[PDB]
Amino acid sequence: VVGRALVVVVDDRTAHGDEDHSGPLVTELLTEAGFVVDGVVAVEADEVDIRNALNTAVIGGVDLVVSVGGTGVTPRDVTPESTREILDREILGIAEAIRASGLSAGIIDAGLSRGLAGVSGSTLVVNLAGSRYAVRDGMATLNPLAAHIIGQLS
Amino acid sequence: VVGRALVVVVDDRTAHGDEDHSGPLVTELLTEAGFVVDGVVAVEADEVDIRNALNTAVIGGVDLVVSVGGTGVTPRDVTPESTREILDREILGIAEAIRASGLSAGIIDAGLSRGLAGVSGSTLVVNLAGSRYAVRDGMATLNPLAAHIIGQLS
Amino acid sequence: VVGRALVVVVDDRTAHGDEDHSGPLVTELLTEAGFVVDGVVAVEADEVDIRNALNTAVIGGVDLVVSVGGTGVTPRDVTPESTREILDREILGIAEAIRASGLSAGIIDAGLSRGLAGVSGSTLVVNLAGSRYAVRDGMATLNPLAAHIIGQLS
Amino acid sequence: VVGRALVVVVDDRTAHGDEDHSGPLVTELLTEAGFVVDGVVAVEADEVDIRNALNTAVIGGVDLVVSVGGTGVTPRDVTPESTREILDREILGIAEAIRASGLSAGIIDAGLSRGLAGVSGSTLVVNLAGSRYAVRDGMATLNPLAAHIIGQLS
Amino acid sequence: GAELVVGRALVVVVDDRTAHGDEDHSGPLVTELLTEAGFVVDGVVAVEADEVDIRNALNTAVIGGVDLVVSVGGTGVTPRDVTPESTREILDREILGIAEAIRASGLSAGIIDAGLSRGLAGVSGSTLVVNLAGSRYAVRDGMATLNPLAAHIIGQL
Amino acid sequence: GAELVVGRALVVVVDDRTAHGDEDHSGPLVTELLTEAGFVVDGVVAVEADEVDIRNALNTAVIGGVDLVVSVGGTGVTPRDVTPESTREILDREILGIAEAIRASGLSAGIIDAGLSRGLAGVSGSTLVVNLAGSRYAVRDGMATLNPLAAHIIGQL
Numbered sequence: 001v002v003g004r005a006l007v008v009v010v011d012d013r014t015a016h017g018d019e020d021h022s023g024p025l026v027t028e029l030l031t032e033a034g035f036v037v038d039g040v041v042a043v044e045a046d047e048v049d050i051r052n053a054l055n056t057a058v059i060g061g062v063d064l065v066v067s068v069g070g071t072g073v074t075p076r077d078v079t080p081e082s083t084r085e086i087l088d089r090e091i092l093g094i095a096e097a098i099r100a101s102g103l104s105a106g107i108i109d110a111g112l113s114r115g116l117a118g119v120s121g122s123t124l125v126v127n128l129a130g131s132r133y134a135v136r137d138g139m140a141t142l143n144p145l146a147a148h149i150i151g152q153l154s
Numbered sequence: 155v156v157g158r159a160l161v162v163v164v165d166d167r168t169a170h171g172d173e174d175h176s177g178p179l180v181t182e183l184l185t186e187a188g189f190v191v192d193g194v195v196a197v198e199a200d201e202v203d204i205r206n207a208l209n210t211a212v213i214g215g216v217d218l219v220v221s222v223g224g225t226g227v228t229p230r231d232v233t234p235e236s237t238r239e240i241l242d243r244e245i246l247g248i249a250e251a252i253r254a255s256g257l258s259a260g261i262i263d264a265g266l267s268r269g270l271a272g273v274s275g276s277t278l279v280v281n282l283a284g285s286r287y288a289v290r291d292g293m294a295t296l297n298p299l300a301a302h303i304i305g306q307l308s
Numbered sequence: 309v310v311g312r313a314l315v316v317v318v319d320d321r322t323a324h325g326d327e328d329h330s331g332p333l334v335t336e337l338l339t340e341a342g343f344v345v346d347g348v349v350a351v352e353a354d355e356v357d358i359r360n361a362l363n364t365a366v367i368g369g370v371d372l373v374v375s376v377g378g379t380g381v382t383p384r385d386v387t388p389e390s391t392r393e394i395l396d397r398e399i400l401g402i403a404e405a406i407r408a409s410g411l412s413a414g415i416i417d418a419g420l421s422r423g424l425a426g427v428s429g430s431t432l433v434v435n436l437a438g439s440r441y442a443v444r445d446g447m448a449t450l451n452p453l454a455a456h457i458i459g460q461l462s
Numbered sequence: 463v464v465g466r467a468l469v470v471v472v473d474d475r476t477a478h479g480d481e482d483h484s485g486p487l488v489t490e491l492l493t494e495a496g497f498v499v500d501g502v503v504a505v506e507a508d509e510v511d512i513r514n515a516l517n518t519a520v521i522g523g524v525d526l527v528v529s530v531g532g533t534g535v536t537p538r539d540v541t542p543e544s545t546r547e548i549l550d551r552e553i554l555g556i557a558e559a560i561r562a563s564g565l566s567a568g569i570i571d572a573g574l575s576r577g578l579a580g581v582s583g584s585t586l587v588v589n590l591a592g593s594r595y596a597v598r599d600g601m602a603t604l605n606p607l608a609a610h611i612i613g614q615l616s
Numbered sequence: 617g618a619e620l621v622v623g624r625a626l627v628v629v630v631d632d633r634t635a636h637g638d639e640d641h642s643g644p645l646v647t648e649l650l651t652e653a654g655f656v657v658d659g660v661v662a663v664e665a666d667e668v669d670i671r672n673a674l675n676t677a678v679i680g681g682v683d684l685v686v687s688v689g690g691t692g693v694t695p696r697d698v699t700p701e702s703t704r705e706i707l708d709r710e711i712l713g714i715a716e717a718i719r720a721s722g723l724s725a726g727i728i729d730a731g732l733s734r735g736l737a738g739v740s741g742s743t744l745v746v747n748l749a750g751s752r753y754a755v756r757d758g759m760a761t762l763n764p765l766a767a768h769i770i771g772q773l
Numbered sequence: 774g775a776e777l778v779v780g781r782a783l784v785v786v787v788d789d790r791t792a793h794g795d796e797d798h799s800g801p802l803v804t805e806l807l808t809e810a811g812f813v814v815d816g817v818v819a820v821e822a823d824e825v826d827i828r829n830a831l832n833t834a835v836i837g838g839v840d841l842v843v844s845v846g847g848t849g850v851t852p853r854d855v856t857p858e859s860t861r862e863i864l865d866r867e868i869l870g871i872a873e874a875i876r877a878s879g880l881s882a883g884i885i886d887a888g889l890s891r892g893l894a895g896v897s898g899s900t901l902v903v904n905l906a907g908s909r910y911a912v913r914d915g916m917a918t919l920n921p922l923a924a925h926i927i928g929q930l
């Protein structure tokens with residue numbers, strides 16, 4: 001039992017009631033890696049809402065938060081800006097490894113993802129890009145890294 | 155629709171009627187990549203049985219065969235030795251990319267997998283290691299590569 | 309036609325009217341990637357001059373600016389410092405991929421390049437190191453990445 | 463002055479008089495790296511002709527032979543089979559590095575190239591894939607490797 | 617013939633128990649590896665995992681004209697892991713490619729403290745400073761990666 | 774407590790001048806690195822760059838029940854570089870991923886003899902055999918890469 005994890009799905013349509021294509025996948029992958037998943041929170045691609053969702057999880061003592069979406073370059077891709085405000089420190093290695101793995105698998109939104117990763121309070125927070133391939137490959141890359149960091153934070 | 159796929163699961167306990175963990179996962183991932191999955195064939199870790207299952211798949215005209223397991227180094231891991239004889243041309247780039255990806259993700263049985271990849275008739279054949287993480291990460295790496303090869307073989 | 313490109317060559321000897329080696333190469337490579345090259349602007353290694361040349365390029369609506377030189381570590385390599393101020397968002401994945409590629413090819417000024425990559429307005433801006441090998445290998449790495457970003461920005 | 467080099471262009475159409483799109487490029491890149499280029503030989507995608515062209519260059523004391531084309535998976539891609547017969551020993555590192563670099567640059571014919579590299583007599587022979595991107599990225603990767611091996615062979 | 621010497625180096629060991637007189641396991645190793653790469657090693661300085669102490673040790677080396685400072689330790693995520701924060705303050709500019717190469721190499725060798733190291737690399741005055749993680753494998757692998765980079769940077773300076 | 778020992782190792786130094794009594798620079802280093810990774814080191818055996826001598830040294834180790842043989846040298850492209858040809862003959866199967874990881878790591882660290890090494894890796898009976906290139910940087914970097922791989926292979930055997 002590695003810890004507690006939360007999925008934050010950053011998508012306007014999903015926030016407004018549409019089917020969630022990312023939450024169950026990330027839940028399945030997190031559960032497989034030994035996490036108990038608190039649930040999935042869906043938020044608009046809005047800086048205030050994203051920050052509030054991340055901060056709420058940190059205050060709540062979650063071990064791992066994985067966000068999905070909002071890491072591209074269109075106007076509304078504000079997940080990295082939001083995440084930057086709430087991090088006490090960055091673990092660049094996590095974002096580099098995820099980008100490196102995405103690029104060589106030809107998953108372009110992962111290879112170029114502006115997503116961040118770091119520690120806020122005692123919580124590891126990681127932004128993943130929104131595509132299903134990005135989600136699968138990012139989690140594959142994250143598995144050994146998250147266990148190590150959470151163990152150190154405990 | 156990219157083409158037709160078959161899954162071969164190399165495992166003694168499965169071939170004797172224990173629960174199959176890999177077949178449904180590979181099928182899920184194949185279908186997601188746009189393949190129609192003919193089905194899953196479970197085979198003992200027997201050099202001849204493996205080679206005949208693969209050979210039956212080729213003769214039957216399937217576009218992609220993915221095998222799972224029997225690629226380590228115990229006397230029983232005979233998958234690469236089975237597969238070698240049915241291959242007309244090896245595509246070393248697929249096996250290398252699978253291994254390099256496994257290694258950076260800390261997936262040791264993938265990083266050290268002796269699995270082959272190659273063309274048999276008009277069928278692309280790829281051996282994956284048996285761990286769940288090896289299955290996931292190997293399929294993520296193989297996705298852009300299979301599509302290209304099958305396109306080239308059509 | 310993928311879009312319009314500008315080349316900025318950061319070099320004192322060139323800005324003073326010596327032969328330009330990089331401009332024609334970058335133009336050849338840009339055109340090959342499907343860009344229309346507006347032209348080459350030669351600038352001194354002056355933090356302000358560089359930043360204004362880049363800024364003029366952005367205001368003029370060009371899709372891709374590639375600069376060459378001034379990304380090492382002498383007091384005179386001020387390209388990244390110029391570029392930082394005009395960037396709205398950094399795309400760290402481009403700079404990382406350029407460096408990792410340079411490093412495995414033994415191209416040290418590329419592997420250690422302090423060059424940035426990011427979005428300014430609707431313009432993608434990328435700093436390359438100044439060696440001929442750095443220009444070639446950086447453009448090979450950038451090709452799939454620029455196309456995707458400009459597509460996303462349109 | 464690193465040594466003497468020969469370009470072997472493996473393409474049916476080019477052998478039969480069509481414009482050569484690869485020869486001048488490889489010549490330019492070889493010359494840039496310090497080689498004197500003997501010329502370009504164009505051959506059919508035929509095992510006998512390819513072998514004869516490679517062997518002729520070896521007997522002739524060429525330091526480096528770069529072939530271009532015939533490394534894919536269609537029936538007529540027989541460059542690796544031809545090259546295998548004439549090599550005394552393989553340098554797998556060259557083919558791995560070229561494939562690794564091609565994959566992460568999204569150059570699929572390079573990432574999956576079945577091209578070989580090795581020593582025949584005192585000659586380094588390297589098969590590159592046929593696309594212009596493959597040619598450019600392969601040469602970038604080959605530059606430091608060829609100089610090292612040729613120096614050892616002397 | 618000192619003709620092929622690359623320059624002067626200093627090792628900074630960031631470790632509390634070492635700062636209080638416990639046997640130093642990192643200093644001699646980094647010294648051996650620096651010397652083998654052609655650096656003349658001034659010595660090893662032990663400091664506590666304390667931002668001011670780390671910062672003072674680095675400033676002294678910079679003021680002293682040392683070409684290469686390699687620190688060892690204090691690059692994880694616990695609260696005492698303050699080497700990067702101490703280092704950032706004294707850097708004039710960062711050389712991202714060094715830290716990226718150390719991490720990428722660490723990750724493929726299964727050296728997790730190296731793969732995740734928040735250690736920085738960059739230039740302060742004319743001094744190259746590189747933070748490595750504390751485990752023995754991080755030190756060894758970090759130095760293997762640093763060898764071809766440091767010498768090039770110092771040459772440029 | 775010998776509880777966490779991974780297994781027994783042997784070092785084979787392939788070098789002509791060392792085989793004829795010149796100071797061995799590789800044996801002690803590989804021994805140090807093997808011991809640090811949890812291997813108990815039987816010793817170092819020096820042989821000439823000769824196919825029969827190399828092959829005999831390897832066969833003796835295999836017959837002896839050694840878990841890991843690391844050879845050093847004879848992996849380039851000159852005519853005396855015969856370690857891979859000697860090794861291929863005694864291998865039951867190859868573990869391509871080891872040789873690929875050593876080369877990829879060597880290449881990014883600018884260690885060209887490692888990046889281009891024709892050295893093999895594989896299993897002979899119950900013995901893992903890995904050929905490394907001869908330079909000091911190849912030995913160090915090769916071992917950093919081998920550490921997480923060897924222990925896993927031996928466990929499986």
Ligand code: NA
Nearest residue numbers: 101137255291
């Ligand atoms: Na991956």
Ligand code: NA
Nearest residue numbers: 409445563599
């Ligand atoms: Na490249």
Ligand code: NA
Nearest residue numbers: 721725757878
């Ligand atoms: Na390494």
